[PDB]
Amino acid sequence: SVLKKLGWFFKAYWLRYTIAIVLLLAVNVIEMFPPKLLGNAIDDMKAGAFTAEGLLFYIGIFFVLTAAVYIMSYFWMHQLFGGANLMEKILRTKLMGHLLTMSPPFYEKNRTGDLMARGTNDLQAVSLTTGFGILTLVDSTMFMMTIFLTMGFLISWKLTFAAIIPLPVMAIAISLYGSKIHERFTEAQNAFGALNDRVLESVSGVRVIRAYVQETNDVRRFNEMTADVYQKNMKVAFIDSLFEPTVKLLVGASYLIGLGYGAFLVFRNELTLGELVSFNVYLGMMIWPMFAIGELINVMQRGNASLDRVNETLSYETDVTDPKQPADLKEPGDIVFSHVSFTYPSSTSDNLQDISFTVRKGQTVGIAGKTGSGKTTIIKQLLRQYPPGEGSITFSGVPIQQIPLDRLRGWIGYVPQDHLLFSRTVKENILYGKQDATDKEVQQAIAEAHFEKDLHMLPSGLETMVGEKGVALSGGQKQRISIARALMANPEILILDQSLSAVDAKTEAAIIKNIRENRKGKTTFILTHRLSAVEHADLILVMDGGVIAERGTHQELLANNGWYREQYERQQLF
Amino acid sequence: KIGKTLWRYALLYRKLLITAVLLLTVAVGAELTGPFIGKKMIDDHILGIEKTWYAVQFHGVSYVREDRLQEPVSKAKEAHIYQVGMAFYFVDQAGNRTVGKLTITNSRAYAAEKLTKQELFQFYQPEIKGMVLLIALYGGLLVFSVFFQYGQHYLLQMSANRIIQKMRQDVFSHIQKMPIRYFDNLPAGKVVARITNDTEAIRDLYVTVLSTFVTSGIYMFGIFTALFLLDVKLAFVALAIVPIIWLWSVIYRRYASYYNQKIRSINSDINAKMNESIQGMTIIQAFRHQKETMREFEELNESHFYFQNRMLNLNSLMSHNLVNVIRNLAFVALIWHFGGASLNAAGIVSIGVLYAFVDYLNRLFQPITGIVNQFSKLELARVSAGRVFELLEEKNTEEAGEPAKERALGRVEFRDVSFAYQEGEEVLKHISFTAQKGETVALVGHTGSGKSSILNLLFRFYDAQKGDVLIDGKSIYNMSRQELRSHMGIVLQDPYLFSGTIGSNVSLDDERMTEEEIKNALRQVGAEPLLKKLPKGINEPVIEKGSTLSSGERQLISFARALAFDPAILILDQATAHIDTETEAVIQKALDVVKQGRTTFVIAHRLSTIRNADQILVLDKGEIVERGNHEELMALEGQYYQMYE
Ligand SMILES: Nc1ncnc2c1ncn2[C@@H]1O[C@H](COP(=O)(O)OP(=O)(O)OP(=O)(O)O)[C@@H](O)[C@H]1O
Ligand SMILES: Nc1ncnc2c1ncn2[C@@H]1O[C@H](COP(=O)(O)OP(=O)(O)OP(=O)(O)O)[C@@H](O)[C@H]1O
Ligand SMILES: [Mg+2]
Ligand SMILES: [Mg+2]
């Protein structure tokens, strides 16, 4: 299976290992002559015919054979150990190529530590298997095959069908051991994924842990998990230590049968002491290296399980998010929702009911209602991060699909309600939006989200390193970097998702004033809970559960009695 | 010193390793006694025909060997048997092997007849008895080292597993006793790698590398002892061999250390970078940075590939390829010494000894093939030990007093205090304020004046450089931060929900609140548990944060868990930002009123939620401006309040 799964790599490179199989045959035969040479030499010594020139011939043959095997197996080592590295690298590239270009509904079903390990640990295991396991398997198989052939013709077939009797038992034992070790190793790989997940969770949540004083209550859980992992490690140690004795037993049985029956053959005069020594050396080289057979199966089944994990993660069908047939219409200004009955993958109810939303040309639309009413669900309908069940964004006539995700994603502005950054300088993560921005538009977006003053606090303006996540930055600063970054693009469609909830009222005034200046005839989706930036719009939809309670602008809402009617006054009387 | 710590962890388990080595010593002793049976079967039951003969009867005359079945005391002929080619000859009465013409020039000549085949077979019937005896002897001897090998393997497996468990536990405890700064300035994947992807390197250093090393070192010692038993001159070269392996371990180290450490560092970078990409995959799939992140990754991947190829040559002139050069040099010596002994026909003594040594060479190299296969892992795990050990041996750590203290009055106080991250950014300057049981709220519009800096200074996440913080006159530098952090609770500005049910998230895996803490959820959560199909205890939110839940709902759960714990001081950080919906934000301040039971620090950028506070601060630019209440509004807070309405 691991061979049938890794073959396509070899079918891609059958110029590098074809040269290496012939090379291994050569180095095995040349290194397999010395046994018979020694048998002949000792036979000559016993008869008293050992002559000086024979010693010179023997030592010369030994030296030349040693040099030949040295070099001509150095090439075989280099080739195969390089092939393993190449396999690992290409698999890693494929794995990250599949992780990308895949919508967010898979990250709820797939872990960040399971995937991180499924890259690093799984690929190092597959590399170790590709190199060392295949090396040993091919070498040992062909070596045993040829040793069984040479002792047959060149010594005898009775002495060699007789130490072969115990090898079928070896085969059945090797079958059972692998049959168990495969399951054990798939479990071990999943367990490493789980361990990485737990450590990642603990590391990410540290202030929440320290502020609550549960260091000890977490070292307890880690200790229990490590104890369970030890228990599993010993449920496999039991089997591995019950396997080795049968291996060594059978090796010793083959040795003893060969030795005794060869002595008996010598008694019948069908074989000589030189031939006895040769056969014993042949068996010693053939069957005694089997002590590493258990490690070979360990490597080969660990690799099989790791590669099965990689394969099952590497083909997931990437959800429903893909251009079917590019419609190739540059953005119509109309976004007309006809009937949208949507149901998240991890839900059993229609989270969104039929919503007849409609926004024409450039019109700020305000969507703000009870929490949990799914306004960011409607927004996610636009971005097509989730499969469409009944959604009909209907850009002009054409539905949401039939658009390039590159172009559709270029139309949208951004949807970061929770703040997100990357470990770099503030300049670089502002440049992170659009096509690397430009020379001075960075400063424009800086002193366009009322963020210029902040640079005084930062010791190195636009140059100080932004720490991992939000380290070295306050919450309002980080949101003000997000707005700047995503205003670098001057999007035709802008989506604000509670983008003003992490800064003061005074700076909120600057943003809305500067957003009013920036947004003139460009459609904007304002989602907020501060019911003041929603005052200006052609339409304001108040969201209640899966349905919009009321529709209108800032005026009729204060006329019709409803959610918006009571929410504005309370924020006004303050 | 890496090796000393490895030895100490090993010595934590002495019984296990000593018993295993003793059992394996027994097994190897049995196996090494093994080949003497081959030696003494050759020299006796095959070469007894070649020694003098004074029962074996062919033709009805010839007598029997001196030591053989049916031994009366009788010697009349002193006959002998000699080997010529594939034929044997029988001389009746009292060298060279030239063919009824047998000559021993050393001269006298005698007559002998060919022993045919059936008559030759007739000779070794007693030899058949001896062969079956010895064969059965060794066959029985095998099953004793059969149950010794099993025992020693199953014992080393426990020794390795226990060692790795202990090391992992120690590392985890140490990382939890590290300062927050350490985590602040290091990627999560980088630290995570040093715990999970780095200790696996040290596990293999124990499970297979060192276990195989001791087994091979136990097999080699026995083999050299047996070689000394047989010969004392060829055993001296055998002893010389080991310094070769020492020089094979020194060279593979002076040539693998740098590249192995580079590979490990690149692997840490690759774990960190992959974590970062997974976390922020929405900015990759919404701002079309996919190709640039792929390019960065591929840069790291090709660097790792290059260093691995910077090691692809050292491992190629090593291992079995090079283990076969010692094997053939052993064969050459076994030929040369025996030849220099047999030039004058003095080589017939070591015909079973020759076979024993020939078998011994086959013995010795397989342990060596085991040893060489781990030097790649040995020098790789030396790096991993250093990275983990440096973490385990760290002097900037903070001793933690685990015990939590009792309830304390809600008395917070701040003297002239001057905090600065990285010694240059003076966040706070001369901050001084007090509270007894009322709501003291810190407000600033500057957005970078250090509100959260004050909050995390109170928790001693970072140590202040000036002044002192005293709760009930208790300097926070009394350490035991578990008592300092148990008196008080925080709702983080950016909440982080853990995995498992929302009830588990509120409970936080503590055995203090029973299932009937729904009141905390029902305190401020309206119909959300009714919205979601099952109650708190049966719905598991998506692992890590509740991406299946909204930001406001996550913040609701975080605030509930802050209230689920009952702190003497309730600290909040923009606790009502993403749940600002006033229908529920008013239930958190109307039905969940702070009341006098708590001393609460309400932080927020909206004046509505702090209108009833009895102490308001400005702390602009790290310096305070106003100390009055809501109605004490003249100039600065007036501006902020006016725009809100
Ligand atoms: N990944 C998801 N899978 C399934 N359901 C989800 C997912 N993310 C969110 N939900 C559900 O969608 C509901 C509606 O969307 P959401 O609450 O994010 O918008 P919202 O009402 O503005 O939130 P908020 O008021 O907190 O700002 C959430 O209450 C939650 O139950
Ligand atoms: N680890 C750190 N190292 C250095 N400077 C930091 C670090 N964390 C925060 N800072 C910076 O030090 C100052 C502390 O301000 P703080 O983080 O408390 O913001 P804040 O006043 O609470 O603002 P807001 O609530 O509006 O975001 C800011 O300049 C902030 O960006
Ligand atoms: Mg929302
Ligand atoms: Mg802040």
PDB file of C-alpha atoms in Angstrom, chain A residues 31 38 45-46 50 62 66 69-70 73-74 78 81-82 85-86 88-89 92-93 96 100 102 107-108 111-112 116 120 132 192 195-196 199 201 203-205 207-208 210-215 217-219 221-223 226-227 230 233-234 237-238 240-241 244 248-249 255-256 259 263 267 280-281 288-289 346 371 406 409 413-414 417-418 420 422-423 432-435 457 468 471 474-476 480 485-486 501 503-504 506 529 563 567 570 572 574, chain B residues 41 45-46 50 83 124 127-128 131 135 138 149-150 153-154 157-158 161-162 165 168-169 172 175-176 178 180 184 187 192 196-197 200 203 267 271 275-276 278 280-290 293 298 301-302 304-305 308 312-313 315-316 321 324 328 332 335 338-339 355 358-359 363 366 373 445-447 461 482 485 490 492-493 496 498-499 508-510 542-544 551 554 561-562 565 577 581-583 586 605 608 640-641 645:
ATOM      1  CA  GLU A  31      30.762  -8.325  -2.186  1.00  0.00           C
ATOM      2  CA  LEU A  38      37.388 -17.733   1.663  1.00  0.00           C
ATOM      3  CA  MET A  45      45.056 -24.281   3.685  1.00  0.00           C
ATOM      4  CA  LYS A  46      43.729 -27.571   5.068  1.00  0.00           C
ATOM      5  CA  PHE A  50      48.165 -22.682   0.509  1.00  0.00           C
ATOM      6  CA  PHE A  62      39.581  -8.386  -1.386  1.00  0.00           C
ATOM      7  CA  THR A  66      36.215  -3.376  -1.110  1.00  0.00           C
ATOM      8  CA  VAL A  69      31.697  -1.666  -3.260  1.00  0.00           C
ATOM      9  CA  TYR A  70      32.776   1.487  -1.415  1.00  0.00           C
ATOM     10  CA  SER A  73      27.393   1.893  -3.105  1.00  0.00           C
ATOM     11  CA  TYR A  74      28.310   5.501  -2.186  1.00  0.00           C
ATOM     12  CA  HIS A  78      23.505   9.435  -2.373  1.00  0.00           C
ATOM     13  CA  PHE A  81      18.773   9.655   0.178  1.00  0.00           C
ATOM     14  CA  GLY A  82      18.369  12.560  -2.250  1.00  0.00           C
ATOM     15  CA  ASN A  85      14.487  14.647   0.363  1.00  0.00           C
ATOM     16  CA  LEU A  86      12.868  15.547  -2.950  1.00  0.00           C
ATOM     17  CA  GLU A  88       9.430  15.336   1.246  1.00  0.00           C
ATOM     18  CA  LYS A  89       9.852  18.777  -0.323  1.00  0.00           C
ATOM     19  CA  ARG A  92       5.172  19.777   1.599  1.00  0.00           C
ATOM     20  CA  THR A  93       4.595  22.095  -1.357  1.00  0.00           C
ATOM     21  CA  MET A  96       0.461  23.999   1.525  1.00  0.00           C
ATOM     22  CA  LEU A 100      -4.531  27.519   0.580  1.00  0.00           C
ATOM     23  CA  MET A 102      -9.676  26.309   0.349  1.00  0.00           C
ATOM     24  CA  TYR A 107     -10.848  24.745   9.507  1.00  0.00           C
ATOM     25  CA  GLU A 108     -13.930  23.971  11.768  1.00  0.00           C
ATOM     26  CA  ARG A 111      -7.315  21.423  13.475  1.00  0.00           C
ATOM     27  CA  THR A 112      -4.463  23.922  13.379  1.00  0.00           C
ATOM     28  CA  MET A 116       0.704  21.768  11.518  1.00  0.00           C
ATOM     29  CA  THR A 120       6.027  18.742   9.739  1.00  0.00           C
ATOM     30  CA  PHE A 132      15.782   4.364   4.749  1.00  0.00           C
ATOM     31  CA  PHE A 192       0.863  13.642  18.102  1.00  0.00           C
ATOM     32  CA  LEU A 195      -0.670  16.780  21.658  1.00  0.00           C
ATOM     33  CA  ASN A 196       0.342  19.629  19.366  1.00  0.00           C
ATOM     34  CA  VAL A 199       0.159  22.643  23.616  1.00  0.00           C
ATOM     35  CA  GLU A 201      -4.121  25.948  23.014  1.00  0.00           C
ATOM     36  CA  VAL A 203       0.386  28.615  24.706  1.00  0.00           C
ATOM     37  CA  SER A 204      -2.195  30.817  22.982  1.00  0.00           C
ATOM     38  CA  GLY A 205      -4.211  31.078  26.184  1.00  0.00           C
ATOM     39  CA  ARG A 207      -3.061  35.465  30.229  1.00  0.00           C
ATOM     40  CA  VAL A 208      -6.492  33.839  30.477  1.00  0.00           C
ATOM     41  CA  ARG A 210      -2.440  33.117  34.567  1.00  0.00           C
ATOM     42  CA  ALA A 211      -5.166  35.747  35.374  1.00  0.00           C
ATOM     43  CA  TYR A 212      -7.371  32.800  36.589  1.00  0.00           C
ATOM     44  CA  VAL A 213      -4.523  30.940  38.417  1.00  0.00           C
ATOM     45  CA  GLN A 214      -4.925  27.540  36.647  1.00  0.00           C
ATOM     46  CA  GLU A 215      -1.304  26.646  35.923  1.00  0.00           C
ATOM     47  CA  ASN A 217      -4.980  22.620  36.885  1.00  0.00           C
ATOM     48  CA  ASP A 218      -3.406  22.517  33.400  1.00  0.00           C
ATOM     49  CA  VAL A 219      -0.177  20.694  34.372  1.00  0.00           C
ATOM     50  CA  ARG A 221      -4.364  17.594  32.492  1.00  0.00           C
ATOM     51  CA  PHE A 222      -1.070  17.459  30.605  1.00  0.00           C
ATOM     52  CA  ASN A 223       0.249  14.866  33.061  1.00  0.00           C
ATOM     53  CA  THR A 226       1.135  11.985  29.010  1.00  0.00           C
ATOM     54  CA  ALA A 227       0.310   9.034  31.262  1.00  0.00           C
ATOM     55  CA  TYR A 230       2.733   6.136  28.003  1.00  0.00           C
ATOM     56  CA  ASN A 233       3.420   3.281  24.105  1.00  0.00           C
ATOM     57  CA  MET A 234       3.472   0.143  26.324  1.00  0.00           C
ATOM     58  CA  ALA A 237       5.934  -2.254  23.524  1.00  0.00           C
ATOM     59  CA  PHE A 238       4.180  -5.449  24.576  1.00  0.00           C
ATOM     60  CA  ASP A 240       7.039  -5.337  19.688  1.00  0.00           C
ATOM     61  CA  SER A 241       8.830  -7.295  22.478  1.00  0.00           C
ATOM     62  CA  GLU A 244      11.392  -9.861  18.457  1.00  0.00           C
ATOM     63  CA  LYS A 248      15.488 -14.319  16.896  1.00  0.00           C
ATOM     64  CA  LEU A 249      14.202 -17.814  17.604  1.00  0.00           C
ATOM     65  CA  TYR A 255      21.246 -21.232  11.650  1.00  0.00           C
ATOM     66  CA  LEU A 256      21.105 -24.490  13.597  1.00  0.00           C
ATOM     67  CA  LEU A 259      24.843 -26.001  10.530  1.00  0.00           C
ATOM     68  CA  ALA A 263      27.730 -31.306   9.073  1.00  0.00           C
ATOM     69  CA  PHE A 267      29.529 -36.900   6.925  1.00  0.00           C
ATOM     70  CA  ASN A 280      27.712 -20.733   7.145  1.00  0.00           C
ATOM     71  CA  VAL A 281      29.065 -17.332   6.090  1.00  0.00           C
ATOM     72  CA  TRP A 288      21.165 -12.487  10.767  1.00  0.00           C
ATOM     73  CA  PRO A 289      20.540  -8.962   9.407  1.00  0.00           C
ATOM     74  CA  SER A 346     -22.614  23.339  11.587  1.00  0.00           C
ATOM     75  CA  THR A 371     -26.604  40.332  18.498  1.00  0.00           C
ATOM     76  CA  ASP A 406      -9.736  36.949  -7.590  1.00  0.00           C
ATOM     77  CA  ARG A 409     -12.421  39.271  -3.762  1.00  0.00           C
ATOM     78  CA  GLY A 413     -13.086  45.642   0.924  1.00  0.00           C
ATOM     79  CA  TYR A 414     -12.614  43.595   4.155  1.00  0.00           C
ATOM     80  CA  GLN A 417     -14.633  42.066  13.098  1.00  0.00           C
ATOM     81  CA  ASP A 418     -12.054  40.266  15.275  1.00  0.00           C
ATOM     82  CA  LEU A 420      -6.042  40.093  12.622  1.00  0.00           C
ATOM     83  CA  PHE A 422       0.847  39.355  11.031  1.00  0.00           C
ATOM     84  CA  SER A 423       4.300  39.366  12.592  1.00  0.00           C
ATOM     85  CA  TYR A 432      -0.434  43.457   3.144  1.00  0.00           C
ATOM     86  CA  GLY A 433      -3.624  44.562   1.378  1.00  0.00           C
ATOM     87  CA  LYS A 434      -4.034  44.778  -2.383  1.00  0.00           C
ATOM     88  CA  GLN A 435      -0.935  44.645  -4.629  1.00  0.00           C
ATOM     89  CA  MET A 457       4.112  56.906  20.785  1.00  0.00           C
ATOM     90  CA  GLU A 468       3.180  38.454  16.989  1.00  0.00           C
ATOM     91  CA  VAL A 471       1.833  42.456  20.928  1.00  0.00           C
ATOM     92  CA  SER A 474      -3.038  48.556  21.634  1.00  0.00           C
ATOM     93  CA  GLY A 475      -6.460  47.354  20.548  1.00  0.00           C
ATOM     94  CA  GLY A 476      -7.549  50.608  18.940  1.00  0.00           C
ATOM     95  CA  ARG A 480      -6.748  51.483  12.960  1.00  0.00           C
ATOM     96  CA  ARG A 485      -4.549  48.444   5.309  1.00  0.00           C
ATOM     97  CA  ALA A 486      -7.895  47.724   3.752  1.00  0.00           C
ATOM     98  CA  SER A 501     -15.900  49.602  18.351  1.00  0.00           C
ATOM     99  CA  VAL A 503     -11.521  53.402  19.669  1.00  0.00           C
ATOM    100  CA  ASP A 504     -12.826  56.474  21.457  1.00  0.00           C
ATOM    101  CA  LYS A 506     -13.277  61.485  19.419  1.00  0.00           C
ATOM    102  CA  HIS A 529     -23.511  48.886  17.187  1.00  0.00           C
ATOM    103  CA  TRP A 563     -36.099  48.002  17.508  1.00  0.00           C
ATOM    104  CA  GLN A 567     -32.270  52.048  20.470  1.00  0.00           C
ATOM    105  CA  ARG A 570     -31.475  55.648  24.709  1.00  0.00           C
ATOM    106  CA  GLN A 572     -29.336  59.951  22.536  1.00  0.00           C
ATOM    107  CA  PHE A 574     -27.015  59.854  27.309  1.00  0.00           C
TER     108      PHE A 574
ATOM    109  CA  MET B  41      31.606 -30.316  16.552  1.00  0.00           C
ATOM    110  CA  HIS B  45      33.146 -35.248  15.025  1.00  0.00           C
ATOM    111  CA  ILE B  46      34.761 -34.368  11.660  1.00  0.00           C
ATOM    112  CA  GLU B  50      42.339 -37.580  11.379  1.00  0.00           C
ATOM    113  CA  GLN B  83      42.850 -36.958   3.774  1.00  0.00           C
ATOM    114  CA  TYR B 124      30.719 -41.527  11.966  1.00  0.00           C
ATOM    115  CA  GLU B 127      29.745 -38.986  15.547  1.00  0.00           C
ATOM    116  CA  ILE B 128      26.055 -38.900  14.604  1.00  0.00           C
ATOM    117  CA  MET B 131      26.086 -34.302  16.594  1.00  0.00           C
ATOM    118  CA  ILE B 135      22.444 -29.899  18.314  1.00  0.00           C
ATOM    119  CA  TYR B 138      22.164 -25.619  21.581  1.00  0.00           C
ATOM    120  CA  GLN B 149      15.758 -11.039  25.227  1.00  0.00           C
ATOM    121  CA  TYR B 150      11.993 -10.589  25.513  1.00  0.00           C
ATOM    122  CA  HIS B 153      13.325  -5.440  25.334  1.00  0.00           C
ATOM    123  CA  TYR B 154      10.071  -4.938  27.229  1.00  0.00           C
ATOM    124  CA  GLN B 157      10.670   0.131  26.312  1.00  0.00           C
ATOM    125  CA  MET B 158       9.421   1.210  29.748  1.00  0.00           C
ATOM    126  CA  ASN B 161       8.819   5.810  27.779  1.00  0.00           C
ATOM    127  CA  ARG B 162       9.201   6.852  31.416  1.00  0.00           C
ATOM    128  CA  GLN B 165       7.316  11.331  29.964  1.00  0.00           C
ATOM    129  CA  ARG B 168       8.077  16.380  28.777  1.00  0.00           C
ATOM    130  CA  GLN B 169       6.449  17.060  32.142  1.00  0.00           C
ATOM    131  CA  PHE B 172       5.875  21.910  30.372  1.00  0.00           C
ATOM    132  CA  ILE B 175       7.370  26.903  30.299  1.00  0.00           C
ATOM    133  CA  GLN B 176       4.405  27.622  32.552  1.00  0.00           C
ATOM    134  CA  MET B 178       8.119  31.656  32.275  1.00  0.00           C
ATOM    135  CA  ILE B 180       4.782  36.809  29.961  1.00  0.00           C
ATOM    136  CA  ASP B 184       5.009  38.206  23.997  1.00  0.00           C
ATOM    137  CA  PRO B 187       5.847  33.047  17.848  1.00  0.00           C
ATOM    138  CA  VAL B 192       5.129  24.983  20.537  1.00  0.00           C
ATOM    139  CA  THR B 196       6.194  18.906  20.818  1.00  0.00           C
ATOM    140  CA  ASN B 197       8.327  18.758  17.659  1.00  0.00           C
ATOM    141  CA  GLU B 200      10.157  13.895  19.792  1.00  0.00           C
ATOM    142  CA  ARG B 203      12.303  10.542  22.503  1.00  0.00           C
ATOM    143  CA  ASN B 267      12.039  23.539  11.132  1.00  0.00           C
ATOM    144  CA  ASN B 271       6.208  25.484  12.323  1.00  0.00           C
ATOM    145  CA  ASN B 275       0.787  28.419  12.470  1.00  0.00           C
ATOM    146  CA  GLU B 276       0.729  32.092  11.499  1.00  0.00           C
ATOM    147  CA  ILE B 278      -3.438  29.036   9.556  1.00  0.00           C
ATOM    148  CA  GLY B 280      -4.691  34.550   9.550  1.00  0.00           C
ATOM    149  CA  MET B 281      -6.016  32.597   6.532  1.00  0.00           C
ATOM    150  CA  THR B 282      -8.954  35.049   6.104  1.00  0.00           C
ATOM    151  CA  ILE B 283      -6.560  37.932   5.212  1.00  0.00           C
ATOM    152  CA  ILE B 284      -4.764  35.475   2.817  1.00  0.00           C
ATOM    153  CA  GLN B 285      -8.075  34.476   1.104  1.00  0.00           C
ATOM    154  CA  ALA B 286      -9.541  38.039   1.183  1.00  0.00           C
ATOM    155  CA  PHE B 287      -6.554  40.226   0.205  1.00  0.00           C
ATOM    156  CA  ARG B 288      -4.949  37.898  -2.378  1.00  0.00           C
ATOM    157  CA  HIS B 289      -1.672  37.446  -0.499  1.00  0.00           C
ATOM    158  CA  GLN B 290      -1.786  33.712  -1.268  1.00  0.00           C
ATOM    159  CA  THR B 293       2.773  33.565   1.512  1.00  0.00           C
ATOM    160  CA  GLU B 298       8.817  27.906  -0.416  1.00  0.00           C
ATOM    161  CA  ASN B 301      11.251  24.901   2.377  1.00  0.00           C
ATOM    162  CA  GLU B 302      14.097  25.232  -0.109  1.00  0.00           C
ATOM    163  CA  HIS B 304      15.617  23.252   4.634  1.00  0.00           C
ATOM    164  CA  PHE B 305      15.964  21.140   1.474  1.00  0.00           C
ATOM    165  CA  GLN B 308      19.390  18.413   4.059  1.00  0.00           C
ATOM    166  CA  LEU B 312      23.218  14.205   1.732  1.00  0.00           C
ATOM    167  CA  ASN B 313      26.945  13.553   1.156  1.00  0.00           C
ATOM    168  CA  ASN B 315      25.735  10.113   5.246  1.00  0.00           C
ATOM    169  CA  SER B 316      26.668   8.577   1.871  1.00  0.00           C
ATOM    170  CA  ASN B 321      28.694   1.153   2.698  1.00  0.00           C
ATOM    171  CA  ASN B 324      31.491  -3.407   4.702  1.00  0.00           C
ATOM    172  CA  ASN B 328      36.455  -7.095   4.286  1.00  0.00           C
ATOM    173  CA  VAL B 332      41.818 -10.010   4.938  1.00  0.00           C
ATOM    174  CA  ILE B 335      43.381 -14.822   5.811  1.00  0.00           C
ATOM    175  CA  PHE B 338      46.229 -17.852   9.360  1.00  0.00           C
ATOM    176  CA  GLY B 339      48.456 -17.947   6.277  1.00  0.00           C
ATOM    177  CA  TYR B 355      35.407 -21.495  11.745  1.00  0.00           C
ATOM    178  CA  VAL B 358      34.679 -16.756  10.711  1.00  0.00           C
ATOM    179  CA  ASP B 359      31.409 -16.991  12.622  1.00  0.00           C
ATOM    180  CA  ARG B 363      28.509 -11.756  14.676  1.00  0.00           C
ATOM    181  CA  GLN B 366      25.540  -6.524  12.657  1.00  0.00           C
ATOM    182  CA  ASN B 373      22.256   3.767  11.618  1.00  0.00           C
ATOM    183  CA  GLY B 445      -9.155  59.023  23.976  1.00  0.00           C
ATOM    184  CA  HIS B 446      -5.489  58.917  23.022  1.00  0.00           C
ATOM    185  CA  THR B 447      -5.921  55.151  22.369  1.00  0.00           C
ATOM    186  CA  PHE B 461       2.339  40.387  33.831  1.00  0.00           C
ATOM    187  CA  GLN B 482      -1.534  33.011  42.365  1.00  0.00           C
ATOM    188  CA  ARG B 485      -4.405  36.925  40.574  1.00  0.00           C
ATOM    189  CA  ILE B 490     -10.095  40.267  34.141  1.00  0.00           C
ATOM    190  CA  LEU B 492      -9.526  40.570  28.282  1.00  0.00           C
ATOM    191  CA  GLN B 493      -9.810  43.257  25.623  1.00  0.00           C
ATOM    192  CA  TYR B 496      -9.837  33.893  23.932  1.00  0.00           C
ATOM    193  CA  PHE B 498     -11.026  27.526  24.947  1.00  0.00           C
ATOM    194  CA  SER B 499     -12.217  24.315  23.344  1.00  0.00           C
ATOM    195  CA  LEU B 508     -12.849  26.935  32.810  1.00  0.00           C
ATOM    196  CA  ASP B 509     -12.195  23.372  34.036  1.00  0.00           C
ATOM    197  CA  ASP B 510     -12.528  24.383  37.703  1.00  0.00           C
ATOM    198  CA  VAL B 542     -15.632  24.800  17.102  1.00  0.00           C
ATOM    199  CA  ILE B 543     -12.237  24.057  18.673  1.00  0.00           C
ATOM    200  CA  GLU B 544     -10.194  27.079  19.902  1.00  0.00           C
ATOM    201  CA  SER B 551     -17.672  37.902  18.469  1.00  0.00           C
ATOM    202  CA  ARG B 554     -17.889  34.970  22.592  1.00  0.00           C
ATOM    203  CA  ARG B 561     -16.903  33.205  33.047  1.00  0.00           C
ATOM    204  CA  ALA B 562     -15.347  36.305  34.595  1.00  0.00           C
ATOM    205  CA  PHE B 565     -15.591  33.191  39.232  1.00  0.00           C
ATOM    206  CA  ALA B 577     -17.379  46.485  22.698  1.00  0.00           C
ATOM    207  CA  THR B 581     -26.122  45.986  21.516  1.00  0.00           C
ATOM    208  CA  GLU B 582     -27.958  48.047  24.098  1.00  0.00           C
ATOM    209  CA  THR B 583     -30.762  45.535  24.670  1.00  0.00           C
ATOM    210  CA  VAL B 586     -28.273  47.345  29.425  1.00  0.00           C
ATOM    211  CA  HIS B 605     -14.402  53.872  25.023  1.00  0.00           C
ATOM    212  CA  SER B 608     -22.629  55.462  28.493  1.00  0.00           C
ATOM    213  CA  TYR B 640     -15.699  63.242  24.583  1.00  0.00           C
ATOM    214  CA  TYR B 641     -19.152  63.156  26.173  1.00  0.00           C
ATOM    215  CA  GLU B 645     -24.573  62.258  21.956  1.00  0.00           C
TER     216      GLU B 645
END
